[PDB]
Amino acid sequence: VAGDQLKSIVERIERLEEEKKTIADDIKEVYAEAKGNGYDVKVLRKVIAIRKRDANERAEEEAILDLYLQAVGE
Amino acid sequence: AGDQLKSIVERIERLEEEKKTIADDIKEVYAEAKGNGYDVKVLRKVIAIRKRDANERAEEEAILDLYLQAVGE
Amino acid sequence: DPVAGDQLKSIVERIERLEEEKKTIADDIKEVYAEAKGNGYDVKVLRKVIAIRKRDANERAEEEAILDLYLQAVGESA
Amino acid sequence: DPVAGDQLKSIVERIERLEEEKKTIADDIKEVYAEAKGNGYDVKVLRKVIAIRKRDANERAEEEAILDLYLQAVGE
């Protein structure tokens, strides 16, 4: 039963991998729609990343960043 | 304008959540395998190998063997 | 095989020599960050400062301008 | 600010100098691979050899033995 069990594990993983790729493709499609509407895809991706984070932490980190940048120059 | 972009953002976020579920499922399968005594590191390697052409895989392995025996440790 | 061994050994050893040197420099960089942290600086922010200084200031200004507008428009996620 | 500001100027200057040094080494490594490739060497295999040599030889032997068994079990 071991041989089959392993084969089923492998097939299970490969299928989830396919599903993950299908979802990645769906995401790419939405970005293509956004680009078509005239949005900046690179910035839009950054928006998504920023929204995952706490607003206050974000605000504080940007405040310190601005402090450092001013000190040494951009 | 604002509503259009918000809808785009919320759709992407929904899809990313679905993708995360799948990624977590994959981690769960590997953990289940480990619990059953399987070698997780090797299992991932098997998956990677099954993606490549058998012949290409075999040639590279043959050259790798050639290189390895020649250089040593 | 004398030839196979000699040819591959030299190329491999040469690369490994360079990789070792690279890691030593990487360790040095880490040491400077450790000093910075000791001085009271935020290492995460400092890394970001380094990355930012690498890119075109004008491109970043424009990208950050568009970013702020997008963020105001869509607000925060639930 | 001599303390808050100028201390940071020195730190950044030092890091950026080291990053340039590291970049030069990275470039030397690329040039080596580019040379080897030009001489008929299989670069992807070379990289794999470098990676392998960083590991315990006995550990790889065991892992490869286990891998062969798994591949057989999955009939692949």
For the residues of D42-74, what is the DSSP string, one character each? -HHHHHHHHHHHTS-HHHHHHHHHHHHHHHHHT
Both structure tokens of A37: 């509407």
Determine the Cα angle at C36 with ends C33 and C41, to 5°. 115
A chain contacts of residue C57, beta-carbon cutoff 8 Å = 74
Question: Looking up tokens 């504080």, which residue turns up?
Answer: A60
- Kindly state whether C63 is in contact with chain A, defined as any CB-CB distance less than 8 angstroms: yes
Asked if A28 and A44 sit in the same domain, the reply is no
Å from A39 to nearest chain B CA?
A: 8
Interface contact C50-D7, CB threshold 8 A = no
Contact at 8 Å (CB) between C33 and C43?
Answer: yes
3-state class (DSSP) for residue B1: coil
Q: Output the CA–CA distances (angstroms, integers) from residue A32 to A36, A40, A50, A58, D21, in the order listed.
A: 6, 10, 20, 28, 40
Asked if D60 and D75 sit in the same domain, the reply is yes
Asked if B57 and B25 sit in the same domain, the reply is no
- Kindly state whether D3 is in contact with chain A, defined as any CB-CB distance less than 8 angstroms: no
- Kindly state whether A27 is in contact with chain B, defined as any CB-CB distance less than 8 angstroms: yes
C36 burial via Cβ count (<10 Å: 0-12, 13-18, 19+): buried
Resolution for the entry shown, Å? 2.0
Interface contact C74-B13, CB threshold 8 A = no
Contact at 8 Å (CB) between B73 and D52?
Answer: no
Sequence-distant (≥ 6) Cβ neighbours of residue B34 within 8 angstroms: B40
- Residue in D53, D60, D67 to test binding to B, most B beta-carbons within 10 Å: D67
Q: Output the CA–CA distances (angstroms, integers) from residue D14 to A13, C48, D1, D11, in the order listed.
A: 46, 15, 19, 5
Contact at 8 Å (CB) between A48 and B9?
Answer: yes
Both structure tokens of B28: 């769960």
Residue A30 amino acid letter: V
Report the distance separating Cα A62 and Cα D18, nearest Å. 26
Å from B42 to nearest chain D CA?
A: 6
Residue-level length of chain B: 73
Asked if A26 and A46 sit in the same domain, the reply is no
Quote the domain boundaries for residue B45: 39-73
Asked if C11 and C30 sit in the same domain, the reply is yes
Helix ranges, A1-74 (H): 2-36, 41-51, 55-72
Report the distance separating Cα D66 and Cα D69, nearest Å. 5
Asked if D52 and D35 sit in the same domain, the reply is no
Asked if B70 and B55 sit in the same domain, the reply is yes
Interface contact D4-A68, CB threshold 8 A = no
Asked if A1 and A32 sit in the same domain, the reply is yes
Asked if A34 and A51 sit in the same domain, the reply is no
Determine the Cα angle at C44 with ends C40 and C47, to 5°. 105
C chain contacts of residue D49, beta-carbon cutoff 8 Å = 12
Report the distance separating Cα C50 and Cα C47, nearest Å. 5
Asked if C25 and C51 sit in the same domain, the reply is no
Asked if C65 and C49 sit in the same domain, the reply is yes
